[PDB]
Design a protein around this ligand. Structure first.
Ligand SMILES: Nc1ncnc2c1ncn2[C@@H]1O[C@H](COP(=O)(O)OP(=O)(O)OP(=O)(O)O)[C@@H](O)[C@H]1O
Ligand SMILES: Nc1ncnc2c1ncn2[C@@H]1O[C@H](COP(=O)(O)OP(=O)(O)OP(=O)(O)O)[C@@H](O)[C@H]1O
Ligand SMILES: [Mg+2]
Ligand SMILES: [Mg+2]
Length: 1129
């Protein structure tokens, strides 16, 4: 993008701030040539004073009056430089902050406004990484590097034109060589922009990997994939590291080339242009050479910033200006009144944008009557959810048209249309907030009476009146801190609160027991009179009350100490730090050495020109290598340090226990932005900042050494001032840390909000609350704005104070030197001491690196607190009992457990069941009785408070976690997947070693998956999408079963393994699962009692304790709770 398109979000006030700050930066830049002029005048008057002393009109001119005059001039320029520096830094920072805030708001608005298929083709980790890092880089490009670049540019141009205005026919060569510098700068800018593009692509890939791995923590722990994920992260880390070192190399070459050219150019100029000049003119010429070279060399980080900003803004602008095909927030359309509910299909044909080669809907024709219940039935993959989504205008038909009461869906207002549809998805998804808030997302004006009535109708009221925080308990993120049936009932309430006209049910009772199913069916039967209900069913029991049934057959419808820690951590990069330190030490020493040698050389017949030219060429020659060395070494050290930080952080994050991830302050959004941003913040201080610091320190040290080498009374007076500089630096660091302390909480919260919004676009679109999430993001973003406007003042004032106290020190030195001259050859001593102290004037800019220092401090502190934690269940711990012959005998003895997130609610009350090896147990009961909790305890995701579980006579709390986990096969209530092929998803079962193709094929065959995957254009290579969301839920359950089976585990865990695949007209998957459970210990929990018919032992669990136990015949004969559960349906 164009460099001046980065300001496309500016308003009039922003333009005013930029103009005023730029004027102040121009004055600050021209401050230094005034210093050159006064030094030249002082030299002239010094020689004019000592000529008459050499002699002995004359006697009329003294020294003290002019010395006080010079001191007053240095006081005036110091006041001016303080004012101008403060204004420039402050104003540029405000302008940048306002622009960045506006662009972030616009980016999120445009992303939310997009259509569903675009989200199918784009990963949420990509967008999160962009929103976190690329806009930050854009901000870094235009914040204050812009002002510093302007100041250095005006200082260099004025140092050049000093020779033109004062002096003549000596600056003929800078005009000759400037275009070469221009082309060099342009080419290096293009190169580093390309390298930046590659670097951000690599970091975006790494961000996607981290997001998926962190959001799939239970699965990645169950199947032991930590090593695979750390390697997967490290690959992208290595790629980005290579691009970063290339950037450092090219930049270091640019800086060294600039220095060497400049010095070589002026050496040749002094060689030939000599063929009149007072010594003061020579003095100011030599020092103008240095000011030009130094500021030109120091401008390079600004060029880095601008090119990185353009490269980063490319993709952000491309996303921001895209026009979506289907706009959920557009006004255009029609809003009819008095809808009846008749919806028809007309020869509809559809293919997903992700798989365009598959015809999923093929010439469909169905009619849905008003005020009736119509049930859709068919096998898995028959395109029922596709029609369900096409009704909502999630997509558009390729051919054909679906009408609502005789009107094309495309011709109606999308907001009004979607505000009349009540949807329950196959897997209800809740947002991390209270229960009443989650239910109220259906209708914002819903009162507490409305919420409680919706909960009562949804058969959810009792289980939330049995909670400690009734209606105010946090459901957790994604509703994870909830049971499946409870989550489903909350979703039913959220759907029914709106009182919709088109009520839509996608397996509305999948995770419900028969009693709650009966209650919900009674409510639906009461409601059925008015609204038109469309529900997909797999069982005839719910079909009993449906008026018409439509069958789907493959797309056709037929009716009926952080600093010390960092220093120790960065030990491996010691040689690069050593070489960079040596190079920057030489670079610091060369300047005062030049001042001394030049001042010596001046005080013109023989060999003086040869000496001058030889010195110039030697300095250019040395400076090229040393500047290159400094830049390259420090860039390499920073890159390696950040790579190691990211790798170790991801490893430590993966090594934590499941209760740590259940913390409400440990969300994947927060952890992802933490991992993405802490390393970058540390980089911003561990890069070339250290090289600049050591360069400046070596400069000041050498300058003071050779100042004290001549007269100690003036050098002491000069050294008297530096405590003020140290105090200013410390104060800035203190306030910066104070602000960053809460800046990081604000950043984590905005990251959590944006990830929760992006990851569940389908749910947010279904309920239609697009505005609420954008408003919440803006509200959470408004918090750091005040902090930013407050830190701008601190930064500007500290920078200005340092630069001002330097000139104060110079004026005081002039006054005291005048006193020493008048009171007590001292003119020569003062000349050389002033020369070196002026050559040592620009080293005090140690406040450019300070604003990043506090960020690095806080980030490193938090990183080490995360790194040094000891989990209660350490999966990286190699200590624990192991026995060679495993048998899979499991028994609970008086197991009790309470969730750490809900300490006032005990879930398990003395669980005690036993299983002999080779037997299966069926856990039956109501929803939320702790059935999945026992499985979590078995998988050592948690540990019982009192009581214990024994595996083959070994207490579970002393057996190795990896060893135990290798012997278990688990399927979850809501299985999850990774965004890769079906093949790799199956291969994930055994992560220790590769498994042959034959085993995968066999597992797929026994999982009833081979035919469907054979039907795909890519057989076993098709991408499944993020979380495996680009498949119907039946095939997700089937791939989960295949992945569990492929391990051949001694313990097999089945949690509602037939929830989605429920077509019971054929006895095939039942035989498949029976053969799977053959010959091994299995625990199978299922709310449908026909599939657990043949279990050896059936345990009925109520309120965390087992109340019945036996086989099917004894439990049936006892007429207990099992008889009522069976006979109720
Ligand atoms: N986003 C997507 N990208 C590609 N293919 C998809 C996507 N969503 C669904 N499909 C495919 O569409 C077909 C039917 O999906 P759909 O979810 O409508 O089936 P279904 O009859 O509702 O199944 P189930 O009974 O398992 O819920 C399947 O082949 C599935 O893989
Ligand atoms: N991570 C969690 N943190 C806190 N409470 C939880 C958590 N997971 C579940 N619960 C609660 O513990 C109780 C039992 O949960 P569990 O998931 O074990 O039930 P379940 O018997 O398997 O139910 P269902 O048949 O609905 O799946 C419920 O009240 C549920 O809301
Ligand atoms: Mg479905
Ligand atoms: Mg469960």
């Amino acid at each position: 993008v164009g460099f001046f398109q980065l300001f496309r979000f500016s308003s009039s006030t922003d333009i005013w701030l930029m103009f005023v700050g730029s004027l102040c930066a121009f004055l600050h830049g021209i401050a230094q040539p005034g210093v050159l002029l006064i030094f030249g005048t002082m030299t002239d008057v010094f020689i004019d004073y000592d000529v008459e002393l050499q002699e002995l009109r004359c006697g009329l001119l003294n020294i003290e009056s002019e010395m006080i005059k010079f001191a007053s001039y240095y006081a005036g320029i110091a006041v001016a430089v303080l004012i101008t520096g403060y204004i420039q830094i402050c104003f540029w920072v405000i302008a940048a902050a306002r622009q960045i805030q506006k662009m972030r708001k616009f980016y999120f608005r445009r992303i939310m406004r997009m259509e569903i298929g675009w989200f199918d083709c784009n990963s949420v980790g990509e967008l999160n990484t962009r929103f976190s890092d690329d806009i930050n880089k854009i901000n870094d490009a235009i914040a204050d590097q812009m002002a510093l670049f302007i100041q250095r540019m005006t200082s260099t141009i004025c140092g050049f034109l000093l020779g033109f205005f004062r002096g003549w026919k000596l600056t003929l060569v800078i005009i000759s060589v400037s275009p070469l510098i221009g082309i060099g700068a342009a080419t290096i800018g293009l190169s580093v922009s390309k390298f930046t593009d590659y670097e951000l692509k690599a970091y975006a890939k790494a961000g996607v990997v981290a997001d998926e791995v962190i959001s799939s923590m239970r699965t990645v722990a169950a199947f032991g994939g930590e090593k695979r994920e750390v390697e997967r992260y490290e690959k992208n880390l290595v790629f980005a590291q290579r691009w970063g070192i290339r950037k450092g190399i090219v930049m270091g070459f640019f800086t060294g080339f600039v220095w060497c050219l400049i010095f070589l150019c002026y050496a040749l100029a002094f060689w030939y242009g000599s063929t009149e000049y007072t010594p003061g003119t020579l003095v100011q010429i030599f020092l103008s050479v240095i000011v030009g070279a130094l500021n030109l060399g120091n401008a390079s980080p600004c060029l880095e910033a601008f090119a990185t900003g353009r490269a980063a803004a490319t993709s952000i602008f491309e996303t921001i200006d895209r026009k979506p095909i289907i706009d959920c927030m557009s006004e255009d359309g029609y809003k009819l009144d008095r809808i009846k509910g008749e919806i028809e299909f007309h020869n509809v044909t559809f293919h997903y944008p992700s798989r365009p080669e598959v015809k999923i809907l093929n010439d469909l024709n169905m009619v849905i009557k008003p005020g009736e219940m119509t049930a859709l039935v068919g096998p898995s993959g028959a395109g029922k959810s596709t029609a369900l989504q096409l009704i909502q205008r999630f997509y558009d038909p390729c051919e054909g048209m679906v009408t609502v009461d005789g009107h094309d869906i495309r011709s109606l207002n999308i907001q009004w249309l979607r505000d009349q549809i009540g949807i329950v998805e196959q897997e209800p998804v809740l947002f991390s907030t209270t229960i009443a808030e989650n239910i109220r997302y259906g209708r914002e004006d819903a009162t507490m009476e409305d919420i409680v009535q919706a909960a009562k109708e949804a058969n959810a009221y009792n289980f939330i009146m049995d909670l400690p925080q009734q209606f105010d308990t946090l459901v957790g993120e994604g509703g994870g801190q909830m049971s499946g049936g409870q989550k489903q009932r909350v979703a039913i309430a959220r759907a029914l609160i709106r009182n919709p006209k088109i009520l839509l049910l996608d397996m509305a009772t999948s995770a419900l027991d028969n009693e709650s199913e009966a209650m919900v069916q009674e409510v639906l039967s009461k409601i059925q009179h008015g609204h038109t209900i469309i529900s997909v069913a797999h069982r005839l029991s719910t079909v009993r009350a449906a008026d018409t049934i439509i069958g789907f057959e493959h797309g056709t419808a037929v009716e009926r100490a952080p600093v010390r820690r960092i220093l120790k951590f960065s030990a491996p990069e010691w040689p690069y730090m050593l070489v960079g330190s040596v190079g920057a030490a030489v670079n610091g020493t060369v300047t005062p050495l030049y001042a001394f040698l030049f001042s010596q050389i001046l005080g013109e017949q023989r060999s003086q020109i040869n000496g001058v030219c030889l010195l110039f060429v030697a300095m250019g020659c040395v400076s090229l290598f040393t500047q290159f060395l400094q830049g390259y070494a420090f860039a390499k050290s920073g890159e390696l340090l950040t790579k190691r930080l990211r790798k170790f952080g991801f490893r430590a994050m993966l090594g934590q226990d499941i209760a740590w991830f259940d913390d409400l302050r440990n969300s994947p959004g927060a952890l992802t932005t933490r991992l993405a941003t802490d390393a970058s913040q540390v980089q911003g201080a561990a890069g070339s900042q250290i090289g600049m610091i050591v360069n400046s320190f070596t400069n000041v040290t050498v300058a003071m050494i050779i100042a004290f080498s001549f007269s100690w009374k003036l050098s002491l007076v000069i050294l008297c001032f530096f405590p003020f500089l140290a105090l200013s630096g410390a104060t800035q660091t203190r306030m910066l840390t104070g602000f960053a302390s809460r800046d990081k909480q604000a950043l984590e919260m905005v990251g959590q909000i944006t990830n929760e919004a992006l990851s569940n676009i389908r749910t947010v679109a279904g309920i239609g609350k697009e505005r609420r999430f954008i408003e919440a993001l803006e509200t959470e973003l408004e918090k750091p704005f005040k902090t930013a406007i407050q830190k701008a003042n601190i930064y500007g004032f500290c920078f200005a104070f340092a630069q001002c106290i330097m000139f104060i020190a110079n004026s005081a030195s002039y006054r005291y030197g005048g006193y020493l001259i008048s009171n007590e050859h001292f003119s020569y001593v003062f000349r050389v001491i002033s020369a070196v102290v002026l050559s040592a004037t620009a080293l005090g800019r140690a406040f450019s690196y300070t604003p990043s220092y506090a960020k690095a401090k806080i980030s490193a502190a938090r990183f080490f607190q995360l790194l040094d934690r000891q989990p209660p269940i350490s999966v990286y711990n190699t200590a624990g009992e192991k026995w060679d012959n495993f048998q899979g005998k499991i028994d609970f003895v008086d197991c009790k457990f309470t969730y750490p997130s809900r300490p006032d609610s005990q879930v398990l009350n003395g669980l005690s069941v036993s299983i002999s090896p080779g037997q299966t147990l069926a856990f039956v009961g109501s929803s939320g009785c702790g059935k999945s909790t026992s499985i979590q305890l078995l998988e050592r995701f948690y540990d019982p408070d009192q009581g214990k579980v024994m595996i083959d006579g070994h207490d579970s709390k002393k057996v190795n976690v990896q060893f135990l986990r290798s012997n278990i096969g688990i399927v979850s209530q809501e299985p999850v997947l990774f965004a890769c092929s079906i093949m790799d998803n199956i291969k994930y079962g055994d992560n220790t070693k590769e498994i042959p193709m034959e085993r995968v094929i066999a597992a797929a065959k026994q999982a009833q998956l081979h035919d469907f995957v054979m039907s795909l254009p890519e057989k076993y290579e098709t991408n499944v999408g993020s979380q495996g969301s680009q498949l119907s839920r039946g095939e997700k359950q089937r791939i989960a079963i295949a992945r569990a089976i492929v391990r051949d585990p001694k313990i097999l865990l089945l949690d509602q393994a037939t929830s989605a695949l429920d077509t019971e007209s054929e006895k095939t998957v039942q035989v498949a699962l029976d053969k799977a459970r053959e010959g091994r210990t299995c625990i199978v929990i299922a709310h449908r009692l026909s599939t657990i018919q043949n279990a050896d032992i059936i345990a009925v669990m109520a309120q965390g304790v087992v109340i019945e136990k036996g086989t099917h015949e004894e439990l049936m004969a006892q007429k207990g709770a099992y008889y009522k559960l069976v006979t109720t349906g």
